[PDB]
Ligand binder design. Structure first.
Ligand code: ZN
Ligand code: ZN
Lengths: 141, 97, 242, 191, 385
């Protein structure tokens, strides 16, 4: 269906205001997340089909910011956004981030970059999403 | 190629329509040159002498009075001035449009 | 991307698809119907006006063209005979058609339409007047059974409704042509049956029965997934629902 | 190339030569007596007549076509005046149609009249003598188009006249046609 | 290269070979275990990580190239308590007021206006079928070992469009979506399809309505084929099968009709891994000679432990579209079982009759034909959909 109603506004607002922190740490992103209480998004009389579909679309939309050509800090913010969306969802089973084959190797290389950048919060969160297997190996996002 | 080679009279080719400021300049040349359609054709390089004759023939149908009025509104003749006036007025027409 | 809709193979310069294959040939020979035959389109008001207009035009043509034929033939013979008396007699027979064209032109439209079972060129009405958008026998049915002014088009009166309900039982709710004729209101068997079924307690159910419950349960167990079932498609298998 | 099937002309385009040629003969007979041919190139008339005859033999499959769209399939080229003849004939048939009530009742126009000519041609001579205003032995004018526009005024007697061309000429008019030495030198500079 | 990419963005993709495409996944996932069908441990609050720490910290240090204490610090900092604005137990049925989301403001606008006697209800959101397909199959495992999805198996998503095109809308599509496995063959997808065209019947029986035919089209004809990338895959497992591809090619290749040359193969020749296909591109499938289905591969992906691993449910129907029933013209309420022509009683031709109305209108108490008409048995695609 595409961009969920009003979701892109919130996602871009959070991502930009995080990027304005000049910081890469997960704690600042969580402070912004909890100040405006982003985690409440999955409530709101969402019957199961809408819950799952909105989770899928939101994770793909955040994927688009987790991908290039965005720079390191904004990609890190997008990774935190993906983590928050995935781990605050109320789905059963937990719906997944759609990851393309053209994106999977670039994203493993991004894991390597996060490790080498010493900004280990993003690297750990990516490995945590892998352990949760939030990433879905799908042809397209 | 096919046997149905339609034939009709094509001498009536599409010529560029005459402009209003161009018509005013034609009347000015009538005033300041006369009815020498060859020298007018030189003054109007866009228009060949036969176009000048055709313009005379069309204008004389109703605007012969204007032909006479222009012809009596005599002026000193300068080729360079006429060329500058033509190009400047046409450029100003384009800018206005 | 949507250009691939059926048929998947469509010709660019001619617009047709592949010919009928063997299986389709044998299916047609066996009378097995295709799903494209299931498309039906509604009669809209201007279509009904067009049908009346076409029928009146057809009747007027059928009436006048013989008259114009007589006029022209008598004129042609009048033009070539040298006998004066025969010339005048042929002119008289031409004047007959000359007056008859005027008289027929002045007829009222109802007189032009005539009786419900009068002859019409349904093929010509279909393939010229209607541009072929509706078939000949379809137009014939519509006209002669619903649209020709002699068919009853009025709402059912209370007395008519009760008498329909009362007499339908004597025939066992069968033989509805007899029911329609006995009702005496010039209804058609289809009209009577439609009215009766829209209020028949034996068809439309507040109630339930063992076989209906059995079929509903079996179809539900066969086809339900979670909360979903095809509520209004189960109607086909057990009777009296919609 | 309409007389046999081809990828350019599927069956809905194919037609029998006899029917269309009869229709075109029935159309050209109308053309001349209506003054349409005199003074004109005829082949436009033939082209328009053939195009409309082919259309009306199966209009449901053919009213969607067009002059060029037609002529290109049979590898034929068409006159531009073909459209002029088409407009003329369409006006003529719309004038014809109003004479019969069972054609008038359909309120025919350019879109619809094409499929009805099969009915009009069966009474043509009757339509003509109910349609022309010139009822003399020798409602609408049966006169060539060049006058159907109506003269602005109907040729009053021309002003045949003479003048006294022996009078003295005004030298001022003669001298006005002469360039001054200033203008002569201007011409020399320009030349 | 068999490297996915869009041809028209978010509408269709460039071509790749399915088997090489799966191997291209597995060269980046094999041995790592992220593609597996076994349950991994999940993220949780920092206060209960003690049991998981021994296993998690060593692996985190190994992969992140950091110390055990650094791994513990990352695990504590990245705990879900920093993200769970919702406590474990809060219900989804109400919008929390303690939020600044524009999305939840728009959701408030969606929900609140329905809280009126005219609109209070718990009906469907937009469409009913999809989650019902997911819930009844998602997360299950088979009772038989032979019906188990192989780890890392490719899962395609195939949209089988109905033969009944709306012919007033073209953006959205009539289809039912079925998932298929890469290793499985086209024969199995052909067999799974429940389309009504297999049930087609006919014949004229106005004189003897009870003599309806004993054979459905499935019993008389069994022809069917898929068409991908210019090749046909026709079924020939039964004598009731004819190779319709030959009939199609012999006409389509005779002129520059707008299509390229084609090639012929059987249904049983190809697995879905053997295909080279485009996602979102309209391909073709057909059966019973005239029942063409447009085939669109809407998705292809690896299997994962959260997926339906019970292969008895495959090809896994996952979406469907809701055709309307053909209701009788007499009663305008019940579904038709008969259709008549030349009917002197019916107001129109054709006229559709239910079994109850058909028999009573056209026959007497003992079943003799009355009036003039022709009748045919009818199976409703608006019902058997
Ligand atoms: Zn099939
Ligand atoms: Zn039913």
């Amino acid at each position: 269906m595409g961009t969920p109603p009003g979701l892109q506004t919130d996602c871009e607002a959070l991502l930009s205001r995080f990027q304005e922190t000049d910081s890469v740490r997960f704690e600042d992103f969580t402070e912004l997340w909890r100040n405006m209480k982003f985690g409440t998004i999955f409530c709101g009389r969402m019957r199961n089909l809408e819950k799952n579909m909105f989770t899928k679309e939101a994770l793909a939309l955040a994927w688009r910011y987790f991908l290039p050509p965005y720079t390191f800090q904004i990609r890190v913010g997008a990774l935190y956004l993906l983590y928050g969306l995935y781990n605050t969802q109320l789905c059963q089973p937990k719906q997944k981030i759609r990851v393309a084959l053209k994106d999977w190797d670039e994203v493993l290389k991004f894991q390597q970059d996060l490790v080498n950048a010493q900004h280990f919060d993003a690297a750990y969160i990516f490995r945590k999403l892998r352990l949760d297997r939030a990433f879905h190996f799908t042809a397209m996002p | 190629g096919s046997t149905t080679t339609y034939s009709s009279f094509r001498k009536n080719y599409y010529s560029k329509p005459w402009s209003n400021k161009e018509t005013d300049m034609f009347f000015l040349a009538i005033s300041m040159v006369g009815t020498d359609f060859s020298m007018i054709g030189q003054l109007f390089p866009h228009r060949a002498r036969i176009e000048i004759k055709n313009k005379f023939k069309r204008e004389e149908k109703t605007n012969g009075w204007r032909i006479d009025k222009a012809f009596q509104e005599k002026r000193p003749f300068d080729f360079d001035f006429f060329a500058h006036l033509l190009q400047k007025v046409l450029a100003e027409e384009e800018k206005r449009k | 991307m949507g250009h691939f809709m059926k048929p998947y193979f469509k010709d660019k310069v001619t617009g047709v698809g592949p010919p009928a294959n063997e299986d389709t040939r044998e299916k047609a020979a066996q009378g097995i119907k295709a799903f494209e035959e299931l498309l039906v389109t509604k009669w809209k008001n201007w279509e009904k006006a067009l049908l009346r207009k076409s029928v009146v035009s057809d009747r007027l043509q059928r009436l006048l063209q013989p008259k114009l034929l007589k006029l022209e033939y008598l004129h042609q013979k009048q033009s070539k005979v040298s006998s004066e008396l025969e010339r005048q007699a042929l002119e008289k027979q031409g004047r007959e058609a000359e007056k008859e064209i005027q008289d027929i032109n002045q007829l009222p439209e109802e007189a032009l339409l005539g009786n419900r079972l009068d002859s019409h060129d349904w093929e010509k009405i279909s393939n010229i007047n209607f541009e072929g958008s509706r078939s000949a026998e379809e137009i014939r049915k519509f006209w002669q059974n619903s649209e020709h002014p002699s068919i009853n088009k009025q709402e059912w009166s209370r007395e008519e409704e009760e008498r329909l309900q009362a007499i339908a039982a004597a025939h066992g709710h069968l033989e509805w042509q007899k029911i329609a004729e006995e009702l005496g209101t010039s209804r058609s068997a289809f009209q009577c049956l439609q009215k009766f079924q829209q209020h028949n307690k034996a068809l439309k159910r507040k109630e339930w029965t063992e076989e209906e419950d059995r079929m509903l349960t079996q179809l539900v167990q066969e086809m339900r997934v979670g909360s979903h079932i095809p509520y209004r498609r189960i109607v086909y298998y057990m009777e009296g629902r919609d | 190339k309409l007389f046999q099937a081809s990828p350019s002309v599927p069956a809905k385009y194919v037609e029998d030569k006899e029917k269309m040629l009869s229709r075109t003969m029935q159309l050209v007979e109308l053309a001349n007596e209506t003054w349409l041919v005199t003074g004109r190139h005829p082949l436009p008339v033939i082209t328009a007549a053939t195009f409309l005859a082919w259309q009306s033999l199966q209009p449901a499959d053919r009213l969607s076509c067009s002059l060029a769209r037609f002529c290109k399939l049979a590898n034929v080229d068409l006159p531009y005046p073909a459209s002029s003849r088409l407009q003329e004939l369409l006006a003529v048939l719309l004038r014809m149609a109003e004479q019969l009530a069972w054609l008038r009742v359909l309120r025919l126009d350019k879109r619809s009249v094409v499929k009805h000519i099969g009915d009009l041609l069966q009474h043509r001579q009757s339509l003509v003598r109910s349609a022309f205003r010139d009822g003399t032995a020798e409602p609408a004018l049966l006169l060539p188009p060049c006058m159907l526009k109506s003269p602005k005024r109907i040729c009053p007697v021309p002003p045949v006249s003479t003048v006294t061309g022996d009078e003295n000429i005004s030298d001022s008019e003669i001298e006005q046609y002469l360039r001054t030495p200033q203008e002569v030198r201007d011409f020399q500079r320009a030349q | 290269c068999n490297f996915p990419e869009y041809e028209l963005p978010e509408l269709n993709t460039r071509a790749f070979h399915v088997g090489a495409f799966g191997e291209l996944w597995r060269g980046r996932l094999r041995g790592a275990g992220d593609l597996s069908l076994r349950e991994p441990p999940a993220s949780a609050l920092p206060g209960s990580q003690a049991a998981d720490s021994d296993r998690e910290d060593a692996a985190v240090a190994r992969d992140l190239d950091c110390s055990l204490e650094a791994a513990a610090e990352l695990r504590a900092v990245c705990g879900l308590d920093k993200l769970k604005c919702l406590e474990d137990g809060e219900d989804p049925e109400v919008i929390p007021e303690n939020t600044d989301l524009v999305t939840l403001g728009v959701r408030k606008r969606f929900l609140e206006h329905r809280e009126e006697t005219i609109t209070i209800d718990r009906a469907c959101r937009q469409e009913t079928f999809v989650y019902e397909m997911e819930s009844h199959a998602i997360g299950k495992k088979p009772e038989n070992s032979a019906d188990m999805i192989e780890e890392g198996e490719l899962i395609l998503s195939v949209n089988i469009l109905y033969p009944v095109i709306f012919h007033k809308h073209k953006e959205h599509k009539p289809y039912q979506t079925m998932l298929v496995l890469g290793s499985q063959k086209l024969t199995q997808l052909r067999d799974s399809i429940r389309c009504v065209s297999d049930l087609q019947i006919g014949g004229e029986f106005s004189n003897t309505p009870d003599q309806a035919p004993e054979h459905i089209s499935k019993d008389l004809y069994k022809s069917a084929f898929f068409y991908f990338e210019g090749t046909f895959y026709n079924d020939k497992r039964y004598p009731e099968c004819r190779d319709l591809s030959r009939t199609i090619i012999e006409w389509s290749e005779s002129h520059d009709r707008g299509y390229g040359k084609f090639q012929t193969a059987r249904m049983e020749d190809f697995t879905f891994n053997d295909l080279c296909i485009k996602l979102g591109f309209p391909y073709l499938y057909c059966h019973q000679g005239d029942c063409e289905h447009v085939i669109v591969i809407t998705d292809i992906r690896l299997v994962h432990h959260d997926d339906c691993l019970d292969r008895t449910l495959y090809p896994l129907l996952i979406k469907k579209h809701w055709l309307w029933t053909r209701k009788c013209f007499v009663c305008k309420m019940y579904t038709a079982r008969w259709v008549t022509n030349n009917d002197s009683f019916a107001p129109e031709d054709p006229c559709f009759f239910c079994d109850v109305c058909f028999r009573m209108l056209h026959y007497d108490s003992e079943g003799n034909k009355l009036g003039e008409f022709l009748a045919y048995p009818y199976v409703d695609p608006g019902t058997f959909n």
